[PDB]
Structures are given as C-alpha cells and as structure tokens.
Design a protein around this ligand. Structure first.
Ligand SMILES: Cc1cc2nc3c(=O)[nH]c(=O)nc-3n(C[C@H](O)[C@H](O)[C@H](O)COP(=O)(O)OP(=O)(O)OC[C@H]3O[C@@H](n4cnc5c(N)ncnc54)[C@H](O)[C@@H]3O)c2cc1C
Ligand SMILES: Cc1cc2nc3c(=O)[nH]c(=O)nc-3n(C[C@H](O)[C@H](O)[C@H](O)COP(=O)(O)OP(=O)(O)OC[C@H]3O[C@@H](n4cnc5c(N)ncnc54)[C@H](O)[C@@H]3O)c2cc1C
Lengths: 413, 405
C-alpha cells in the first residue's frame, strides 16, 4: 500500500517523484513507483557497444537553447556533456542546397494553407514528385505523414539538429551525455530512493479501479500477480500505453487526439574507421535510401536513425535475420557514398532497437492542451511529453512532470 | 518468413528436436526455423556465473539420455554432493522404515493423494510431520498421488535413500548446464537452423497445406510465419494459452503445474564450515525448506509450490525484508542466534511460476488429431520435471515428424 503511486519510471515519472518528495505537503506520504521494465528510463536507453562506446538506443541529444529544464537537470545531477557534432550537412545534395530558399519561399503560404499536411502543402506549389524529392531530403519520414501539418513540419525542421539551418536556427547548440543519459535517470532515481520512494521494477499495470482511493492490478514479468492500493495515482506513461488500461482514454481525459510513429536506430562498429578517409568523421549524411540519416561518430562507430515507415522497414529486415539486415545496410552505405559495395567493410559488432511508439504527440488542434491531464471522475493524473509542445523531447517530460506534480499537490488539497 | 519445419521452444526439448531432424538424411537442405519468446535459449535451464537458477543436477542411472548428451558435447561434470541428510531430525531418521511399511499398501490405495494415503494409516498430524520433512511441498498436493509421490522421492537426490536408492549418483555441470544448451545450439546452427529469439507465438491456423503462425516480438513487432511442419516444444501451460484446443484435442489427460523458487547467497567468508555444513543439505519445516551449502563457495535454498509463492511475495515486498527473512530462517534451521549469520555480499533468485509440469495420470510426444501439429515437453513423459524427460519427448517428437515428412 502507498499514499502516492507513480506508474512509469521514465524521466517523466521519476521527475514527478522528485518534485513531490521535494514538497512539504508530501512529508509522511509513502510513494511507490512501478515500471514494466527491469530498469528505469523508458525511452532513454543507454548502452555499451561491445565494450567500445556508450551509445543511445533512445533519446540522444539536447539543446540548451530549446531544452533549458533538461540542461538545468544535467547540471543539477552532475552529468558530463559533450558536443553533439551532427548539426549541419557537410555533403549536401543539390536538392539539399536548395532547401533553405525553397522552404523560405513557401513560408508565407503557411498563412493560407499551413494546416494541411506538409506533403500536400509542398505539392500544392511544386507538384508531387518535386515535393517528394524535397521533403525526403530532410531525412525524417514523419514529414510525409497525413497528420503532420505544414506548420508542424516547419516547427520539426527548426528543432532537429541535422536540419535546423534550413529554417535558420544554426545558433542552437547541441550536446550529448558523455556516459549516456541513463546516468541522469540513475541520478534522479538515487535521489528519490534516498528520499524514501520505493521501486517495484518489472511490473506491468493491467488495470485500475477506484473506493476512497485506488486498487491497481499488476503483473510481474515472471508471472507474479500483485494488487496495490494507493490514495493518489499518476500514470507517467505515454498515450499509447494509457489506451491499453481500462480508464477510458482519451475521451474521459481531454478528448484530444494523439498521434504516434515508430523509430529505429542501428549502431555498427568496424575493425577500421574507414569513413575517416572520406572526411565523414563527426558528420551526418541524409540520403534517400532506407538508411535515411547516417551518422559517423569520430572514429568509433557509425549509426543510422529512421522513423515512420523506414523504421518498420528496418524492423522487418531484422525479423528476417541478422545476415540480410547487415547486407542491406552495407548495400545502402555503398549507394550513399557512391562507392562500390566491396569497398564497404563488414561490421564487427552491432546493436539496434525498434520503438513501436518512439514519438507520441498531440494532434493539431484549436483547443489548448494542458501539460498534464487528470481524469474527469477519478482524479487520476496523466503525465507525458506527448502532452506538451516539446512532444518527442525529454524536455516535454520535465514540463509535464512539473504540471502533474503541481496537480497532485493540489488534489492533496 | 517461412520454413519447412518450425520449432517453437528453444529449451532442451526444442533444441534436441532440431538436432534429431537436422541429423536425418530426410531433412537434408530443408529450411528450419526455431522461435522462442526469450532472448536466449535454454528455457528452464538457466546458468549464471557458476549457479543454476533452473535445472541443476542429473544422475547417470536415472538420466542415461542426459548423460549421453553431456558426454557427446564434451561437457564436464562435478559431484553433486547433496545426496544424503547428514543432520537428520528424529522424523527424518524414521522415514525409510515408515515408507517401507506403507509401500505394500500402494496397490490398495496408491491412487489416493499422498497426503490422504499417509493420513489413512498414520493420522493427519503424523502424516503432515512426516511428509513435510521430505522437503518437497509438491507432496502435499491433491494432484500428487501416493504412487507418484514414491516415484518423486526415489528420483530426487536429497531423499532417494528413503526408498533404497542411495546407489544412484548425481552430478552437476562444472561450467553450468547452459554450456550444454550452447553446444546443442551451435551444432543445430552449424547445420543451418535459423533462430528467432524474442518472439512469442500467439496463435496458429492450418492455412491449407501448412500452418500460419502469428507471433509478437518483445518490442511489439508483429510477425506472421508460414511452415509445413510444426513442433510446439513448450510446456502444457503454454499450449493452453494458444488457440489449439489443448489438452482436449490432444491426449485428453489433464496436466498439473507448480511453482519453484531458488535463492543464492554469497558471503565474505564461508561461515557455515564451522558447523561442518560444507557440501551438506538440511531439510527443515521452516519456509527455506531445503538449504544447501556448496563447498566453501555459497549457499542456496530451493522451494516449491506454496513456499515458492511465499518467497516470491517476499521479493515483491522488497529486498531488505526478503534478506532479513532468509537470515531469520537460516538461524532457526541451525538453532543459533540471528547475529551469528552474517549479511551476504551478494545474492540472486529466480521464481518459476510453472517450474514443474506433469500429467495427472501417454505417448512421449503428442499430436493434434486434425491438424498434425506436434507437441513436445518433459511433461508428457515418465521423467516429467527432469531434462531427461525433455530428451525423450524430443526423440519421439522427431520420430513423429519424420513420419509426417
Ligand atoms: C529513438 C528515439 C530517439 C529519441 N531522441 C531524442 C533526443 O535526441 N532528444 C530528446 O530530447 N528526446 C528524444 N527522444 C524522446 C524521449 O525519449 C522522450 O520524450 C522521453 O524519454 C519520454 O519520457 P516519459 O517518461 O514521458 O515516457 P517514457 O520514457 O516512454 O517512459 C514511460 C514508462 O512507462 C512504462 N510503462 C508504460 N505502460 C506501462 C504499464 N502499463 N505498466 C507499467 N509501466 C508502464 C514504460 O516501461 C516506460 O519506462 C527519443 C525517443 C526515441 C524513441
Ligand atoms: C527450479 C528448477 C530446478 C530444476 N532442476 C532440475 C534438475 O536438477 N534436473 C533436471 O533434470 N531437471 C530440472 N528441472 C527441469 C528442467 O529444467 C526441465 O525439465 C527442462 O528444462 C524442460 O525443457 P523443455 O525444453 O521441455 O521446456 P522449457 O525448458 O520449459 O522450454 C520451453 C521454452 O518455450 C518457450 N515458450 C513457451 N511458450 C512460448 C510461446 N508461446 N512462444 C514462444 N516461445 C515459448 C519458453 O520461452 C522456453 O524457452 C528444473 C526446473 C526448475 C524450474
């Protein structure tokens, strides 16, 4: 039993625990934190690649100009930052060199047609084939989706490091975590455990019922069933996960609608840093082939990152088998570089991760969305980056946690 | 995503089926796919560096097929010492005699539960005290008949002496039974088996000739796989989750299961040497139930059925309480003060919600009347609860599938 239960130990849930435990109104309230995974962190998943480097299977970068709360958290918990180098395109295609003017040329038309999908918007002025080639040249297949408006696309482009110069946001600086953002998740976790929160990792919330308070049915990843009673409940899970529980989401919560799209990253190490030769170190290529964005980190490893249908494409390759997945990568590396396949070596060790719901966000609405939500009848609070204007970014988790904890403090009344 | 032959389950049964099939001239060049919901093969064999969180011992006398696998794959063995009770309670001293006296009555009343059967002749309280001192709470289950209980006692090393089977010898794997799983795996792979670990079978349908399997990856990825021949090398509990009308359309026997739990602890010093406990096992009434001290390396305990659940509930309530309970029950087992039991340096545990599965009582593998699907598990065998049973089921499941080809 607890007074306060948080389900979700991503950055959102852990940060809620932190604000709550920082407050005098929470003195003497026991706090329980569940997560279905065996480690805290959610979409922040740092990993050692074959003992050679720390890589980010999930969130990988931030900007102090866009993400001031996150920057403040990194400093607070004493995490070392290094420069994220992938902030420009050193090897632009001809289409990519036209991007800035092309985009600038269309911007005033956002007034009249900015609510339609970016693909239709661009197509309205350039026709289909040219719109396709231009949009594809920015490397985020999200920009092809029907539920990404032209206004949303301009926003997206200005906030991603590889293409921020297209909308003239080159001033924004970007950083990564020298030892992984998991170190921040560990630092928050250590702080909340030190203040008395109790962690139950490995349990998946299946359903919730109200009488004075709440009764939760959870299942352990080894089969162990658990029931837990709390007086106050924050579900620090994304919209997709909310939809799996029996709490009538979103009708009973906001009635807003939430989009979702998958993500994929693959990291590969090589015997020789063969890309040094071509001056690719610390650079990113954005290409039309299914690798889409190819990043070469120093002389240590390379990786690629894709979304939406290309993420599903890569996951399907993996399902067929390692060998064909690796060979497909080699074929697309050779095409991207314009050199012959046998000149791309075979990798030494690699890792990959597919996120079925890597990004979740509020769909374009005329209703303002609050940063955290509560259930009409039950007073259950819902916390996620998806509910903020930084949907898709750790910053939106911090923003949502601030509001969720504020709301819980006010319910505690 | 298709195969000629698909095996779901990469425990020792599934891997051994793949082994048999890939050895047969009839499967030369056929495409063979093996799925498992976990990210590593092995199932209920799980080694950690070296302790056994799952299966931990075998006997050459009881498990000749197992001994032959260990031999064929050059896996080394070490004496498993926990083969007699050095510190018998008064009740434990009486067990061999009392079990000898009851045994003639199995022919009359041996189909009753072991508890009923012993109560019948000794009374409830006496039966409880006796049955308890054998250390397997499976022996209290209405599902476990007197005749099955005697089979159980004769097969388990810590109490085999009780039915005149001290002669049976026991060994563990010197590098863990996972090295055996890794050997079978590397061999089926070299022969061209393809693995898809991390996928859970949800359902199957018989699309024309063949079968269409629906699977979910552990990251959510949904996958459909077509095959021409199918072995489900999963236990009955898992078969029941599928859409294949198990057990009715197969055997029509009924199947039992019970949970298991093991906890392992290490210490700055092997403190138990003071009590001459190295390489000895104690069976106690308290919740630890069977407590083993392994040379001067570590100790562990091993429980089943409702004491397995007790320990899983403890773990769920938190580490401190769990570690404290263990410390409390170790002192009572030894009859010494709590403070004489140091705090561990490290520990690990594992709960198996379906640790043992068995037929309530049968061929060694099954097949579905209508669909031709084959089912393979130690549960369908005379060695349910043992890796040997898995090897026997795989022989038969392989034989059935070769027939089908
Ligand atoms: C590939 C990828 C790259 C990214 N890159 C960046 C980047 O460069 N910069 C950046 O700022 N952001 C990035 N992000 C986004 C960032 O990861 C998210 O914005 C943030 O991590 C979300 O935190 P959260 O705590 O709201 O949700 P999550 O991190 O999703 O955590 C929710 C938690 O709830 C748990 N859960 C869900 N349902 C249940 C249930 N029923 N019971 C129990 N537990 C449950 C999950 O296990 C999870 O731990 C990236 C994301 C991905 C996927
Ligand atoms: C605690 C413990 C101690 C033991 N000690 C001993 C011992 O000392 N000696 C001994 O001989 N035996 C022992 N055993 C028994 C031995 O572990 C088993 O008899 C044997 O390993 C069973 O092998 P199997 O391949 O038939 O089934 P499992 O090992 O249970 O393999 C079944 C596999 O199927 C997979 N699976 C299930 N459902 C699905 C699905 N829907 N989709 C995909 N995959 C699926 C599982 O992930 C698993 O890998 C012990 C067992 C336990 C639990």
């Amino acid at each position: 039993s607890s007074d306060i239960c948080i389900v979700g130990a991503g950055i959102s849930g852990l940060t809620c625990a932190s604000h709550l435990l920082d407050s005098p109104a929470c003195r003497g309230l026991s706090l329980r934190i569940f997560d279905m995974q065996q480690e805290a962190g959610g979409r922040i998943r740092s990993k050692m690649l074959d003992g050679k480097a720390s890589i980010e299977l999930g969130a990988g970068r931030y900007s102090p100009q866009l993400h001031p709360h996150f920057q403040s958290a990194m400093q607070h918990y004493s995490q070392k930052s290094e420069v994220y180098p992938f902030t420009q395109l050193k090897f632009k295609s001809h289409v990519q060199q036209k991007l800035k003017r092309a985009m600038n040329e269309l911007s005033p038309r956002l007034k009249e047609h900015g609510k339609e999908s970016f693909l239709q918007f661009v197509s309205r002025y350039q026709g289909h084939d040219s719109a396709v080639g231009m949009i594809r040249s920015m490397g985020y297949d999200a920009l092809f989706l029907p539920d990404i408006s032209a206004e949303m696309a301009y926003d997206i482009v200005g906030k991603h490091p590889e293409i921020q110069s297209v909308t003239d946001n080159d001033a924004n600086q970007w950083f990564a975590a020298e030892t992984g953002f998991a170190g921040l998740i560990q630092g928050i976790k250590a702080k909340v455990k030190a203040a008395g929160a109790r962690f139950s990792l490995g349990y998946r919330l299946l359903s919730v019922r109200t009488g004075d308070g709440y009764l939760l049915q959870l299942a352990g990843d080894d089969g162990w069933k658990l029931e837990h009673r709390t007086r106050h409940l924050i579900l620090a899970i994304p919209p997709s996960a909310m939809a799996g529980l029996n709490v009538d989401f979103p009708e009973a919560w906001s009635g807003a609608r939430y989009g979702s799209l998958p993500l994929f990253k693959g990291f590969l190490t090589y015997g020789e840093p063969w890309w040094l030769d071509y001056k690719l170190d610390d650079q990113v290529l954005i290409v039309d082939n299914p690798l889409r964005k190819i990043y070469f980190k120093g002389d240590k490893y390379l990786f690629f990152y894709t979304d939406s249908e290309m993420a599903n494409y890569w996951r399907g390759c993996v399902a067929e088998g390692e060998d064909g997945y690796l060979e497909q990568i080699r074929t697309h590396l050779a095409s991207a570089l314009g050199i012959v396949r046998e000149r791309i070596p075979q990798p030494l060790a690699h890792v990959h991760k597919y996120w079925a719901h890597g990004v979740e966000f509020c769909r374009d609405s005329d209703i303002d969305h609050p940063s955290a939500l509560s259930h009409r009848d039950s007073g259950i609070i819902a916390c996620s980056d998806a509910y903020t204007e930084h949907a898709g970014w750790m910053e939106g988790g911090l923003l949502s946690a601030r509001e969720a904890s504020r709301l819980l403090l006010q319910r505690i009344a």
